[PDB]
Paper text:
Thus, the BBSome is a key regulator of the composition of transmembrane proteins in the ciliary membrane, and is thought to be evolutionarily related to other transmembrane protein trafficking complexes including clathrin coats and the COPI and COPII coatomers. The recruitment of the BBSome to ciliary membranes (where it binds transmembrane protein substrates) is mediated by a highly specific interaction with ARL6 (also known as BBS3). Here, we use single-particle cryo-EM to determine structures of the native bovine BBSome complex with and without ARL6 at 3.5 Å and 3.1 Å resolution, respectively. The structures reveal the mechanism of ARL6-mediated activation and provide new insights into the pathogenesis of BBS-causing mutations and the evolutionary relationship between the BBSome and other transmembrane protein trafficking complexes.
However, our 3.5 Å resolution structure of the BBSome:ARL6:GTP complex shows that the head remains in a closed, downward conformation even in the presence of ARL6. Rather, BBS1βprop swivels in its cradle between BBS4 and BBS7 to accommodate ARL6. This swiveling action involves a rotation of approximately 25° and a movement of 13 Å away from BBS2βprop. The N-terminal half of BBS4 shows a small 2–3 Å displacement to accommodate the movement of BBS1βprop. The swiveling of BBS1βprop opens a central cavity in the BBSome with dimensions of 50 × 15 Å, wide enough to accommodate a polypeptide chain. This cavity is flanked by the newly exposed edges of BBS1βprop, BBS2β-prop and BBS7βprop as well as BBS4 and BBS8 in the body. The first and last blades of BBS1βprop interact with the switch two loop and helices α3 (residues 75–78) and α4 (residues 98–108) of the GTP-bound ARL6. Density for GTP and the ordered switch loops of ARL6 are clearly visible in our reconstruction. We also see an additional interaction between ARL6 and the loop that connects BBS7βprop with BBS7hx (residues 320–335). This linker is disordered in the BBSome-only structure but binds along the β-edge of the central β-sheet of ARL6.
Author numbering:
A (entry chain 4): 29 to 402, 408 to 424
B (entry chain 9): 642 to 828
C (entry chain 1): 195 to 406, 424 to 479, 483 to 590
D (entry chain 1): 1 to 66
E (entry chain 8): 64 to 81, 90 to 141, 158 to 499
F (entry chain 0): 7 to 58
The structure:
Amino acid sequence: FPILEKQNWLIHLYYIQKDYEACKAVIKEQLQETHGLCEYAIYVQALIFRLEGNIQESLRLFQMCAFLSPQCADNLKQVARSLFLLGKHKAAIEVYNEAAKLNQKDWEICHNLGVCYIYLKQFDKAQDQLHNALHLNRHDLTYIMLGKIFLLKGDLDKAIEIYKKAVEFSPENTELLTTLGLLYLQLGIYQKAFEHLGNTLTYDPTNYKAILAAGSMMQTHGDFDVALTKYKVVACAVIESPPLWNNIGMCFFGKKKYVAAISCLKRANYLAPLDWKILYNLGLVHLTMQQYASAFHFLSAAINFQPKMGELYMLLAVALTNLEDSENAKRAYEEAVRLDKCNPLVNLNYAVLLYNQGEKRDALAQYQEMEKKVSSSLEFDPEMVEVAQKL
Amino acid sequence: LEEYFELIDHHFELRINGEKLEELLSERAVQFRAIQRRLLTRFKDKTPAPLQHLDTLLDGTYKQVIALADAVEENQDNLFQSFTRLKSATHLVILLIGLWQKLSADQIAILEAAFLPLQQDTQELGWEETVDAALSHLLKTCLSKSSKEQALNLNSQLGIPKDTSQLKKHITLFCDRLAKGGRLCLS
Amino acid sequence: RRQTVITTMTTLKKNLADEDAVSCLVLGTENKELLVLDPEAFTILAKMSLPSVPAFLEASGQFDVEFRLAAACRNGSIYILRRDSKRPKYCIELGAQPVGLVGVHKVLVVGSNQDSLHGFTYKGKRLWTVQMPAAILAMNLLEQHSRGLQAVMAALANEEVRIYHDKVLLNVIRTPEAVTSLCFGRYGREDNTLIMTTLGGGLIIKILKRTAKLNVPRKTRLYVDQTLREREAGTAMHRTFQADLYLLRLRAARAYVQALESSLSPVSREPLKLHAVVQGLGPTFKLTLHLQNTSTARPILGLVVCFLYNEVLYALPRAFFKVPLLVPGLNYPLETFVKSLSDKGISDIIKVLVLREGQSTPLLSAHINMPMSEGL
Amino acid sequence: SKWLDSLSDSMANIHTFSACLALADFHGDGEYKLAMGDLGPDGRQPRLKVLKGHTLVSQKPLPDLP
Amino acid sequence: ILDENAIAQVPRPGTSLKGPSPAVRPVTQAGRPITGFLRPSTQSGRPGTIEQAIKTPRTAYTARPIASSSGPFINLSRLNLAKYAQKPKLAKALFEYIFHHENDVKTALDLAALSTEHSQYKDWWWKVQIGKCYYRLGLYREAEKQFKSALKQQEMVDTFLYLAKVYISLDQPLTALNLFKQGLDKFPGEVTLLCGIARIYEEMNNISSATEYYKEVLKQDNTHVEAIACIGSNHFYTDQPEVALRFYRRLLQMGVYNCQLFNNLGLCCFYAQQYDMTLTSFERALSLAENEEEVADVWYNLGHVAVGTGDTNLAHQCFRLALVSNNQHAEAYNNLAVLEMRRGHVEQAKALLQTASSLAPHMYEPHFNFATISDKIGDLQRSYAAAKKSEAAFPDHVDTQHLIKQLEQHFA
Amino acid sequence: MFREVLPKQGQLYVEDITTMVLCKPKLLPLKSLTLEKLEKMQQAAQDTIHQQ
């Protein structure tokens, strides 16, 4: 006969100030007095459990709260969310459906159905559900999940529009700006990428995920010292990260500091022995340093990690040409020219190998293949014309 | 399914009593160790001093520890007897299920594997958790078509439960979904 | 009957809005309803329907002609109530449950559970957001009419209180303990009193004065000599390393085939994984075999474990036993009690074979070097 | 140093909230008191306490938590 | 655990015994990176409770498996020690026999007491022997008394090292260091004293002085296996494998012929980029290994060489052989699970990472990888329970922090 | 007399992706002389026990 929810306000005020100690005591007292049926000493207790690592007792207590209020869309939403926090997404979908047939006007059900169908690789239903989630109430996370769908399924041609429309409003989210800048890097545009990365860096100066891409873009267009300073900005925050040290080694390899680049690249390779980019960089630098015994080793590793590349086999063949193994260089160059489409350096180097082998016959074939493929490198220009005039 | 559940409940009551006896023996052993360390400190010291009846507390704690050890031994014996009787009962129940429906040798072997898992109980794996996991999985992959129940009720773990209601629910549900026409499989 | 409880309560101005005006109550029932009361607290003037239980309330204006009622609910949302609207129809979600609500003459601040403030407009469009270094325990209003300063406060959980105007911080204070409630008004006889209560109790009353480069490694002579040797003798190194790699592949394949023959791999279609742990000194050791089925969804029905020991050194009670139905994903600990029989310390290996019941070749195996006895 | 400190005490068990604590005039004559419905030291004993100056003048029990 | 002798219970961090991060240097406990030159005095951390010490591997806190506490030529119960004590020529050898052969500390102490009273307490040797009897009976202060009284008679390196042991047993590093510097003031260039100073500095884990003192040992000895091994390991792990290769080629030059030395030479040769002498060293190692754990470690390192070369199948075989040879090899489990998830088999990787994290909880890689794969598929509860244990293992990690932030954000 | 031309630009990471880390190569610690002597004296007793 006492009032059922006597102290829901006090429990809510203790839980909302991040106490979780006095709130639990008041929850226990209320439940002991009311013998259950409170529906908010169980709800807040389950939310507290979910705040801790445990997502099992949270699911149990949300089940009890759903049993108490069988027609209450929020309880079904919370139970499906406790499912989705575990690995079960089909059951999460089937509980979100019931939560939707009691409330057809909320964005959370549609956003969560989208993120579930994403984990279930059902992209039509996920895409349509997230379009709905936008139309009900546009949120940043729905935009992010839609961009993720359009990236996984197809091309950036569908993601650039969504990310631009997303950053259009609420443009202070670093994730949206940075992801749109990254997707600009993924395409030919290097200017708007710099624009959005600088927009991010104004808000957060020490953003590691943005500093990395900005330094990459800088390294691409020379001026290695600016990228080196960008990396100095974040070096202490991430002192052991293979990508940072790989980019720093490429910085030091740009300005002819080959030893201080081998150092950084080997350090990054030790912290990630399965990363083909660092292996390719080590092979390239050991080629430039004229060592030709470690270059082959690192390039063969990077081949064994990403075999469907053209430049890898070209560099391995250049390492084999100076290792007194010309037949292996022949077959490696054949692999490369078969596996390369838009890099004439491979063709020119194979023409050089052939002409140095005394053939001069197939060297013309490789020269014609290169000239069909084609344009900026200063030293690939001269050998282009020298192997031409001398053939 | 009803004179069979009482044996399960007797077994589980013995298991819970054993866990309580062991967590009490833990505290008694900790007390004994603390008083023993105090006495060792009094021993290493040169200067004489009253024992302050520390030896009496040690004797009392030792009596408590011996009593609890004997209690745990007797509970282990009772638990073993209950486990053997439960093995006989579940043998009979699998027999009556394989006759009550025209169960072939394959499904009878599956049932014998799921219901007769162990030879005795240990402080890490018991009959309840193992048969519960096996039955939850057999209902998950063969006899259920709703994913909501598959994820809510039909889950499997290997920790000692706090009640036997889930096991009994799963056994009754197994017999039920066999009655409607279900059949067992492995893949 | 099913009554309700009142949780939030503020007042609302009738027509004058001065120090002598008449104010009317506004109650927030636990049932999702807002009761706009009478000047003398006996009859109802209005009943407003809200979609969720309110937690915080803000009343702006005069009730008869221009009232604005902002309600921070438990579902993490601010609902505004205007004239003629029984339902808000202008809602704003915060993403986190609002821990406070203070109304500035034009901007409405909402304190988030994410340790920040969010200034919105009374139409339902956020205009700014500021980040706090720690949690927000209580937000009140600091208003002095001499300088016209009407700024929101913040009782942060990091033992400080910072007064916030539109965007700038000022007059940040410190406290010996984090503070749960702050009030600013004409307490005593001072127009600028601020009284604050510590999370642990106690009171702190403050009177405001009216006169307000990298770690790139180094390389020594050893490195340049080694690189010179590599540059002058790279071909021999390449050839001999390739020969060594060929011989290493040969020997690794040899040992892998020998292990497959003896079936000595504790990890080996037919998915399983077993490893045996030994625990305890003294003549009696606890030997627990952790066995696991590693497959998507396929149980393994007929398996059995057989121990191989030296019957003169170890007394295994049950050196052979069936294993339960192995459900994919669960580690089954199957334990036994090994006991050393030798009066002298002798450590001998114990083999374990997991095998089908219709086959005679072990599915997999494991080894355990039993430690010394420390007997009696 | 804009905030002139007046009183710092730690024995006053005042576990109120930012909404159940309000100051106003309560006997005229331009002397504002501060009335607060304070919970128990834990939340068991609802007690209404009013403050004038910085000494407690009246605390009296309350039916339920304000 | 059951013996408390340190005066201070919670002394200042830096004055009690009770560098490269776990992302580079392998570890044995929550901290305590792996050392060179295992000596039978290594404690390398200590357990908290008897249960934890029992339920862990027997050789995870000592170079040897932990115990519970640390015809015949002559029958000890037949001879009257009061008559052999009169003859010191017999008494000294008889005490050495009783103490080091029969291990009868009580009768040894009886003989030593009668002998010391026969010599009117004027020979430091009997004082040192009584002090040793005490020290292994448990009485440290009663042993420090005799060691001090023996130092007063005649300074010897023996008594200095004995007092160092006594002081380290009472958890007093800064007293042992002052005593060692006093001894070096007596003996200006002793190698054992400098090595004890370096051991104490490494137990306190400030390597920047242990390297200096090991370098002093080198300036004195230059064949010291301890200092050479320690400086070599430190040189290898701080991304300078060529200097470590030199330091280990030194031990190779001095006739040392082990399985550990040759595997070390292989790691150094490969990581210092000397591909001609790399795999033959691993072959000599596999040849010299007198165990099943040494063979497993050599196969583990060969798998590391292979995965650095590419050809993940060879590394797969080497890790599986490391498992075949030592079933409780957690690094092999972790690496084999990484290669499995590289192939695609997620459940195999999950089970193997669970096994690794069950065998070695103090490691951070199995927990981090399990949390990563879980989060990749979902199961944010398991991801949290694993990333939190990762943060418990390597608390200054970076990816673990981002994982925990993302998880705690998903929970609201 | 033509020398093969090598690209002057390496591969640069443009995002940090959480990859499963491997355990690190383990330098087998050497032993002392006392430890070797103790282990050999411990195993010699076993050998004599088995050889009687």
